[PDB]
Each structure stands twice: as C-alpha cells, then as structure tokens.
Design a protein around this ligand. Structure first.
Ligand code: MG
Ligand code: MG
Ligand code: MG
Ligand code: MG
Ligand code: MG
Ligand code: MG
Ligand code: MG
Ligand code: MG
Ligand code: MG
Ligand code: MG
Ligand code: MG
Ligand code: MG
Ligand code: MG
Ligand code: MG
Ligand code: MG
Ligand code: MG
Ligand code: MG
Ligand code: MG
Ligand code: MG
Ligand code: MG
Ligand code: MG
Ligand code: MG
Ligand code: MG
Lengths: 52, 147, 52, 124, 52, 187
RNA sequence: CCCAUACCCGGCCGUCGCUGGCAGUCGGCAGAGCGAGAAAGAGAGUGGCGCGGACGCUACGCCGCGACGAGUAGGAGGGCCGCUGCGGUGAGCCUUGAAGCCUAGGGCGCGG
RNA sequence: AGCCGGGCGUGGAAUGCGAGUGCCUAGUGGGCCACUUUUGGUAAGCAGAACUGGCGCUGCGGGAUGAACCGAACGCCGGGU
RNA sequence: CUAACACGUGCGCGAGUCGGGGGCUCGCACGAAAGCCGCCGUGGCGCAAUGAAGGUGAAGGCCGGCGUCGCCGGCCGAGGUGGGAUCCCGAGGCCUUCCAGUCCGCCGAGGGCGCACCACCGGCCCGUCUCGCCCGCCGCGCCGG
RNA sequence: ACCGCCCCCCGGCCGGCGACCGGCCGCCGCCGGGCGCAUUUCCACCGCGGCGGUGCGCCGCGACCGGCUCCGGGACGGCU
RNA sequence: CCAUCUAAGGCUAAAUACCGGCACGAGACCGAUAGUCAACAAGUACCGUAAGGGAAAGUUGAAAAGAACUUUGAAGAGAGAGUUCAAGAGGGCGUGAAACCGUUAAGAGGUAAACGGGUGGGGUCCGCGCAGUCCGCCCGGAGGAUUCAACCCGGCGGCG
C-alpha cells in the first residue's frame, strides 16, 4: 500500500511524547529475501582471510 | 560451491563418469591447438574458416588514436541536447534553429540512419555522410564542419 | 527518507537513487480472490469426488 | 500484507521445528501448534489464541484487536474464563461465531479449550 | 593456494535493494517476532526516541 | 511385456517459475486460480509466460508497443506484456497507452505518465479484467539476443551466414583460407 | 495333468500423463448444487421456539483418475542420508553426567 | 511467369498415432553369434560381406550342464491360466 | 584451485551498464568490513558495418506545380504474401402461468486487428563486375557526386 | 527572467484508513459484582442400562453380501 | 622542405619490491599417520669415505596423596592393607575400537566354510503383560454445591 502512517516518538521515560513523524517511504519497499540472502552470502565473504 | 557439483553425486562409481573402454588419460589428442592442419583439420575448417594463411598489408607502428572517430546516427541526433531545447525550437515561431554540436558530446562523424523530426537544426560536426547531409537539407537545416 | 528518497522524490544524499519499483501493489491475495468483480467471472467449483 | 509475510516466514521462522518427518509451529497464538497459513498466529490481522490460565485453573482466551496492528503492546485482549466445561465451551463458541471473528478457527479453539480443561483436572 | 577467489563484488544497486528490503521488513511485527526477538511489550516496533 | 518406448514419455515444459522471489510466486498463485477457474485462455497464456525464464521474456520497447497498438481496430485497449517495457529514445511523439507489465523502466514510466497513460501491474489487471477482455498481448523480439547469430548451420560451409566465435575482429583473424578464393577455397 | 518374474483379477510402492480438481471454510447478515449425452443463466427486474453444523489449505499443500516400471558406458533429479567449520536461530542439551566406545534389548526408513 | 479480386468443404483410400522446432551435450569409434544370401579356403569354434534379430547391457521357464538355442523380457506380493 | 571461452539458468539496472583502480569517511574488537564519490565513467563491453587499404557507411510511399514534368511544394510515413497463440465484432442462441416488454451475463455462423516465430518476395549499407548518361565548383582537373 | 520537479500553507474535488483512526449513536458478544434460590445449573458415584465412535490381552469359530476364479448337476432350443 | 631534442660527464628523496632478520597482531586453516622434517634432549638419534640422506616420539591424577605395614618367593612377580570420586586412572598410567588370543556359558558338528528364500526348535531380554480399552450423549438411583435463565451496574471487544 501507498499509505504512510504517523509514527509517534517515545520519550526516554517510555511514554509517548507529543512529537510524531510520518513513516519514511523506505519501510514500504518490497521485501525480497532472495536479494537479501544473495547479498549477504556474497558479502560475508569479503572479510575473510586467506589460508593455504 | 562443492556441494552442488557433479563430483559429489559421482562418488562410488568407479570410472568417475569417464568410461571403462576409453579411460581419462592425460592428453589423447595433443596439447592446446595441436594438429590444426593434420588431425583436427575437419573441426578447424568446419568451425573456424580462414584460420590459416595471411592477408592484407602490415602496419608497423599502429596508433589507434589517429583513427579514433566515433559515430552518431540521426535518430539519436536529437538526444544530444535536452528535451526542453527541442520543444522550445518546436513551438518557436521566429524560425530560429537550435545548434547541436556532436564534438562537444564526443562524436566526430554523423551518419544518417533514422527518420528526422520536421524542424530546422544546425548540426555542426567534423565529418558528414552524403545521406545524413541530404536528410538534414530535406528536413531544413544546416551542416557545419569544425576541425 | 533523505537517504533513500521517497516514491516521487529522489534521494538527496545519493547521486541518483530511488526506491525499487513494486512488482505487485495489492499483495492481499485474499481480497484479490474475494472481490466481486473477479468472483463474477468464474465457473462453478466442481468439488465432488469421483472415486474408481 | 499477510500472504507476503507468510511467504517470507513459511520456512525461515524461529518457531519452526522440523524433525521425524514432521513440522511444528511454536508461536503463542497458534491453535494446533502446526505450520499452516490458517493457524499461524502472527500473520493474520484477526487471531484467536487459547492458553491455560496463570492460576492453576481457568482458560485465557486472547483476541487480536483491529486497530493497533503495529503496536504489539496494545494489540491483544485477554479474557479469563473459570467455569464448568460446558459453559466455557459455549462462551468461546459464542465469542468466535457471533462476532464473525475468524470463524474458521471455531472448532480448533473449542478442541484446544477442552483439552486444557482436562489437563487442569486432577489426575486419577 | 593463497590466490583463491576469496572476495566477491556485488552491484551497488543490489546492495541498496537489500538494505531497503531489510529496513522495510524490520517494521513488521510478524517478521521481527519470527526472528526470535521478544517484543510483545514494545509499544510500537518502529521504535523512535528523541535525540536526548 | 508391452511394445512401447519411454524416451519421450516425460514432457519437459515448466510447471512453476524457477525463480525464488515471492512477488512473482504470488502472481503465479493468483493466475493459477484464474486459469483453472476461468474458461478464458488469455489467463492460461499469461500464467505460462509467467513461468518462463528471463531469456524467454525479452524486453519490449516503447516504439514496438506504440507501433503494434497503432494498428487499426485496437484503439483504447490495454497492452499486456509479461516482460520489461524499456524506453526507446528514437521516438518523439508518444500517445496515451494503458500498459501492463511486470516491471517498467524509470524513463519509460516517466514518458508514459507524461504522455497521459496509466501503468498497470498484473494484479490490478486481474481486478480490471479477470478474463482479460480488451487486451492486446504483446511480447519482445525473442530472437533479439546476439547468441542466435552463432546458431544454425556451421560457418565454413556453403550458404551459411553464421557468425564464428572469434576473440577479436580484424584482418588477421579468420580471413585467409576458408574465406577467399585466392587462398585455398571459398565456401 | 505340472509350472516362468509371461497373460487375467486384486492389494501396495514409485514414475509419467490428465500442463486434472480444491481460495466455496460463500452460515439466523446462511441456505450447503454445478456427474449431468447434447455450445451456452437454480439470471435480475417492468406492463396486460431451540443460536446450532466433523476434517481441511506446511497451495513448495491436499485430493482424484488412467497407463507404465530391465539395464553396462553414460546423462539428469531428489535425498527430514552422512562428515567438518562459519552466519543466524532453538529463554536447546549437559558433572542429577557431553563426546566417544560396547551390546543376545525396543523400533523406524525400500535405502543411504 | 508474377500479381490482385471472386466462387466452390461430401477435408476426396484403409489402419494407427498429438506434432513441430532450438540449444548444450557425455560415452562410443577392438565387437561377436544365428536362419537365409554370399567371397576366399580341402576345411575350421578360419578369414570377409548383405538383411534381420540377438549377446554385449539381461535377469526368468526349458535344452542335465551352457554369453547367442526354444518360450518369454523383470517394481513387492495373493489367486487363476 | 586460477584464468579464458561457450551455453543454460537466478537477480539488479536497461540503450545503457559496470568502480574492479583511486579518493573521502575521527583508520583499526567485529572493521583487512560497510558507506559515499557523479565534473573520480578515465576506461571496458554494447549502441554500425564493410573493405587488404586509401575510405565509404544502413527505407521510402501518395497529390498540386511543364505524363512527350525539367523541377518546387502539399502531404503520408519504415514494406508485401502465406501460416499464426491471444483479442474485437457478431448472424443466429441460452426456458417454465401465459402475454407485452426489458436489463445483465454466458453461447456462437461468419468476419476483423493480427504478438512472437518460420518460410518466401522486395528494399537499404560496404567490397567487386558490366552498361550508360547526367550533375557541382574557390582552385573546371588523371576533380568530386 | 522562463521551464521542469519536489517540500510547505490555503482552498475544491476523488479514493483509502483491511501494510494507515478518534469521538457520538445503534446492534451483538464477553468478563467482574448484585439480583436471582432451586421441577433450573453444575460436580462426583452406581447400573454388568441404551445409542454412537474406536478397539478386542492372547488364541479361535460361524454367518450372509460382493469381486475374481476352478468345477459339478439339470433342463430348453437351432442348423441338422 | 618541416617537426623535435642536444649524445658520447655527474648527483638526486616519494610513490614501488621484500618466502631472510627483530618485534608484534590476526584467521570461516591443521589438530599428533594432520599441520613445518621437527608440539617432545630435531636437523637430534642413526646411515654413508664424502657430497648428502634423516626419523620415531604429546595426555596418571584436582592435588603424588606415586601404594606405609603383614605375608610367600632368591627375585621378577603376587595375596592382604591403604590413598583417591575413581587404581573399572599403579609411573609409555585419559578414553581404550578392530584384527588376533585365553577362559566361562549355550548350541552344533562325516560332502571346507560361508550365503539367499521359507519355516520350525531352543535361548537372552522386553511388554515393568496375566481377567483386558476408552470417549461422548442419554435413562434410572443414591448424593453434594451458594447454582441456571432473565434483569441492573461497570469495563472490554467486534460490526455498522
Ligand atoms: Mg553407471
Ligand atoms: Mg577418449
Ligand atoms: Mg583432460
Ligand atoms: Mg511391466
Ligand atoms: Mg528423455
Ligand atoms: Mg493389475
Ligand atoms: Mg529402471
Ligand atoms: Mg557383536
Ligand atoms: Mg579403443
Ligand atoms: Mg566370421
Ligand atoms: Mg538393448
Ligand atoms: Mg535376453
Ligand atoms: Mg544336452
Ligand atoms: Mg503366481
Ligand atoms: Mg649533455
Ligand atoms: Mg645525462
Ligand atoms: Mg645514478
Ligand atoms: Mg583485525
Ligand atoms: Mg590420536
Ligand atoms: Mg595415550
Ligand atoms: Mg573413571
Ligand atoms: Mg588406559
Ligand atoms: Mg560347550
């Protein structure tokens, strides 16, 4: 959906503060576990030291 | 990954997918491109004609930069400038024609392939083709040479 | 939303980036079946078993 | 939506346990404790759960409310029923049916309630 | 041998797509709970607190 | 004992997309239901083309789409393509179209929306027309890939205009023996 | 009169085909069908008490009909077969006893 | 000869059966046997061909025994023939 | 295992695409990661081919102006035949007291528009051959078209 | 200066609030407390009581029905 | 004709290289037949005239608390006793497999043994078997409850 609700900002006391911010458009992006898994797999290989 | 490869499924079959009569020996036919004219002649002639022999002249100190000459076509010619340029020229009434310089965008020769929209253009380039020239003249416009 | 841009606004902090386009918008399959305009153009559901 | 997250979670859940040619689902509001689209208690907007009471006797019925879908703290309403089995089952049946609240789980909820109740009765 | 292909490169657009998908999925209570996080008491899972 | 052969017993066609993404699979669910509970074969064709691979769903250009929709009789109908609609830059005038595709290039979408048409996705297409009346089913040029220039009757063989596999184009690369009557033979 | 792994009838496993069926779980807000030789509407309209009803549907699921099943070299698919390490996850297990090893004990899977 | 336009369906033998098409590709390139035809040879369980079927790659009933003969080809079982 | 190539498959973007090299990010548990560069796309591959090379370099179809038009305008626009999944139309046709009379939906002779793709016929670009005439000028030539 | 896009304010429409609600009213359901006071409601026990479902601790037998088979005994008729 | 340098003398840091050396950090690596040949008195023992070749070899226990003392024997070696959570950890001692061997128990035995199919017999253990299932809805009888329906108050939820 294209609806962007209003998200409240919670104070450090845990209760709702008066402020609130609209939901950023990023959270409506498509969910693709395929791409997420592919990018993780291939990137969690770039912090790897050689062995031989 | 080694998990998905054919070797894992091949364990236990003595042969390893290479036959019992003709084994997997080292280099049965010779290494590399050996026997191109003797015992691989049929394959070479059937799939790479013209491989053997010489043709043409030799140019020793070839410099690609001398012959560098990128080309553009008339259908792409209007994409060099912004759309607002073209629409302003289109609804202009004074008869003024926009100037398109392909050398600025990195093209040297203009070749005339596509259809050209009916509005005057001042195309300035380094080299032109006869058909591109006649297309520009027919649509109404000017051809300008630069060095 | 400045980092990743909205649907109609490009990302300001990145050179040229925009949110990936949705392949399907209304992903409520339950609705997409249970809506009148699609249920009208359907044949009767044959649901009686014919054993040997 | 719902089908989208179901496709996401059908095989990559922490509540999933698969062994002995079986598969089971663990999240709280899931009658029959099995991995299925109908009975998955976290996907749907309207969800029913039946749990044993915190006290040694009684049954807690949990109903997902309609407004706070993204507010987990205030998303479930819990009611404790501590009576005879027949009236407990009748109340659960009325709650499921006369509210038009996810009617496909009526028999599952009744079966689960009956069970919890028996468990609560002292052993022989 | 030490010259095995240890590292991999992924397209920048694909990396951004994966990041967007992860961010969008972090806002759904079902997926966060299925990840195992205990958030049944959290007032609102797109949890925002002030800059204090 | 039965005198039969089992070579061609099993058919090779696809039963489901090889892809693993979830949006395409949801589309496949919806169109599976539509195809099996509707007598219209447009749904069957669309579902079959959803199953297909990337190289079997070539992109369709804006120029192709406008050219195929400018034909007589097919005014104000929705152009349905299971591939990708890519922009064509060598076309200035673009009319208003009612397009449906899995994905559309950003520039192509901008062009259509500026021209005044509307972009549809196969979901909303189901809602608009379940059996798909008033639809023009198009597809990109499948033989457009350059791999098809290497296929067919082998080069170096008479009346075969097949592109050879050469690492570099030039006068020193496959031009001497089989390509000239002056050196050996000419095929 | 006798009998083969052949043929006929029946059960079970699997494969292939029907690119078969099921989103209709449409319930006091309802009315339980789309097996029936005949391409297509249980069509919409205007004038002469008792509160009640099993299972389902990991749709990568479930269900129904037919046909078929030899195999070296070789090809392909599925393995909730197995070994070691890594990222996640099991508010996992464990000195009230882990790994490993032995067993005339109880079982599962066609098999690993 | 090529073009256009128009009219004719009792789909013009029997029987059977879905068909067409495109890529990539392993192994193989020592064969042997049998009825019939057949060349060399005194002849051979010899050497060499044609057609078809087999063995090789194949278990099962029979020929006591058996690579090829006769019958018949194979998922695990019960009954009948 | 590395490199190269081919083809098939999955994903992102798409006439574009790709930071692999470098740089900016208080360097540094993870982090030797990750993010960013866009006037760092140099550059590679693709978007144009052909010829040994000098080089050249990819449609055209109708009316008014001198059919026995020189030649300017008005236009229209990237072929044609056959086969073609789908879609459009639709003669007729889908019921019940009768009768007038509708709405909506399904059926369907024939007829349309015809995707991809195949076959065939034309057309255009480069090399080469044969025939023949015409045109342009800053330098009228072993010139150019 | 002009054009395109975007953010914000105001005004007018369209749609959604089931990836995104508050108040009022109505209906329904549930829960807690009184009212209710036992021909109602509930809990536990007994009968070798009945109906329906699933099974028998082990070892057995019979009956009828249907499918597939092998065989026997009768009777009738046609070309002859 | 043009273009561009000024040879046959000299110096010069930075960006660059680094399986030796000193001092460090780390690892999707190996885990005592692996990883360096070398985890240990390893380039050691040992071989060759010499050039040179070149191993095997980790683990008691938390702590030696490492078994005082009696007894048989010449002694090795035992029986008692003792330490320990454990000697079922006793100085090449964690765990302790297979091949192979001794003994005990059971069974069998003239076509080498072994094997597939089908039964039968005997065993070790198991069912923690040995008067045989439970579940609704009724009917009848013996009981006992702070008891049902309907209303009122308050709260909550669903739908419009
Ligand atoms: Mg094999
Ligand atoms: Mg070979
Ligand atoms: Mg090789
Ligand atoms: Mg068979
Ligand atoms: Mg095959
Ligand atoms: Mg049978
Ligand atoms: Mg087989
Ligand atoms: Mg043993
Ligand atoms: Mg050979
Ligand atoms: Mg012979
Ligand atoms: Mg064969
Ligand atoms: Mg045979
Ligand atoms: Mg004999
Ligand atoms: Mg038999
Ligand atoms: Mg000098
Ligand atoms: Mg000098
Ligand atoms: Mg010097
Ligand atoms: Mg570090
Ligand atoms: Mg060891
Ligand atoms: Mg040891
Ligand atoms: Mg011990
Ligand atoms: Mg030991
Ligand atoms: Mg004995």
């Amino acid at each position: 959906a294209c609806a962007r609700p209003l998200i409240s900002v919670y104070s450090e006391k845990g209760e709702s503060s008066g402020k609130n911010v609209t939901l950023p458009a990023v959270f409506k992006a498509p969910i693709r576990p395929d791409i997420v898994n592919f990018v993780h797999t291939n990137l969690r290989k770039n912090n790897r030291q050689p062995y031989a | 990954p080694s998990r998905l490869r054919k070797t894992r499924k091949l364990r236990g079959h003595v042969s390893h997918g290479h036959g019992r009569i003709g084994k997997h020996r080292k280099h049965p036919g010779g290494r590399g491109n050996a026997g191109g004219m003797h015992h691989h002649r049929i394959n070479f002639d059937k799939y790479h004609p013209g491989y053997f022999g010489k043709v043409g002249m030799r140019h020793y100190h070839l410099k690609r930069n001398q012959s560098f000459c990128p080309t553009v076509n008339l259908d792409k010619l209007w994409t060099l400038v912004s759309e607002q340029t073209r629409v302003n020229a289109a609804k202009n009434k004074t008869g003024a024609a926009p100037i398109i310089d392909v050398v600025r965008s990195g093209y040297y020769k203009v070749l005339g392939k596509g259809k050209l929209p009916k509005q005057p253009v001042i195309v300035k380039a380094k080299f032109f083709s006869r058909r591109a020239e006649e297309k520009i003249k027919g649509v109404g416009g000017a051809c300008v040479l630069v060095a | 939303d400045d980092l990743y841009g909205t649907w109609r606004k490009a990302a300001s902090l990145k050179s040229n980036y925009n949110l990936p386009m949705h392949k399907m918008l209304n992903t409520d399959l339950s609705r997409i079946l249970k809506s009148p305009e699609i249920q009208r153009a359907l044949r009767a559901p044959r649901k009686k078993i014919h054993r040997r | 939506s719902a089908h989208l997250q179901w496709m996401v979670v059908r095989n990559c859940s922490s509540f999933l346990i698969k062994r002995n040619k079986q598969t089971y689902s663990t999240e709280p509001n899931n009658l029959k404790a099995r991995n299925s689209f109908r009975y998955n208690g976290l996907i749907h907007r309207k969800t029913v759960g039946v749990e044993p009471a915190a006290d040694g006797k009684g049954v807690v019925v949990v109903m997902k409310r309609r407004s706070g879908q993204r507010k987990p703290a205030t998303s479930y309403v819990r009611t404790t029923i501590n009576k005879n089995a027949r009236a407990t089952l009748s109340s659960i049946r009325h709650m499921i049916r006369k509210n038009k609240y996810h009617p496909d789980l009526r028999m599952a909820a009744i079966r689960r309630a009956s069970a919890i109740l028996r468990s609560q009765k002292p052993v022989m | 041998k030490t010259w095995r292909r240890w590292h991999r490169r992924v397209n920048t657009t694909q990396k951004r797509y994966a990041i967007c998908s992860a961010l969008a999925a972090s806002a759904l209570p079902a997926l966060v709970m299925s990840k195992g996080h205990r958030i049944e008491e959290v007032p609102e899972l797109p949890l925002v607190v002030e800059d204090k | 004992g039965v005198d039969i052969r089992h070579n061609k017993d099993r058919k090779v066609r696809r039963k489901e997309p090889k892809s693993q993404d979830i949006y395409l699979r949801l589309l496949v669910k919806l169109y599976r239901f539509l195809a099996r509970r509707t007598n219209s074969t447009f749904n069957q064709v669309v579902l079959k083309r959803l199953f297909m691979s990337r190289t079997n769903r070539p992109p369709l250009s804006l120029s192709r789409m406008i050219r195929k929709m400018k034909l007589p009789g097919r005014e104000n109908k929705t152009a349905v393509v299971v591939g990708t609609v890519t922009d064509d830059v060598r076309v200035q005038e673009v009319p208003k179209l009612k397009v449906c595709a899995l994905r559309v290039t950003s520039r192509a979408r901008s062009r259509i929306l500026k021209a005044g048409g509307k972009i549809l996705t196969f979901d909303q297409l189901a809602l608009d027309s379940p059996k798909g009346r008033g639809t023009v089913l198009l597809s990109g040029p499948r033989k457009g890939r350059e791999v098809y220039r290497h296929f067919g009757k082998a080069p170096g063989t008479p009346h075969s205009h097949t592109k050879p596999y050469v690492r570099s184009k030039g006068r020193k690369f496959e031009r001497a023996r089989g390509r000239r009557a002056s050196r050996g033979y000419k095929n």
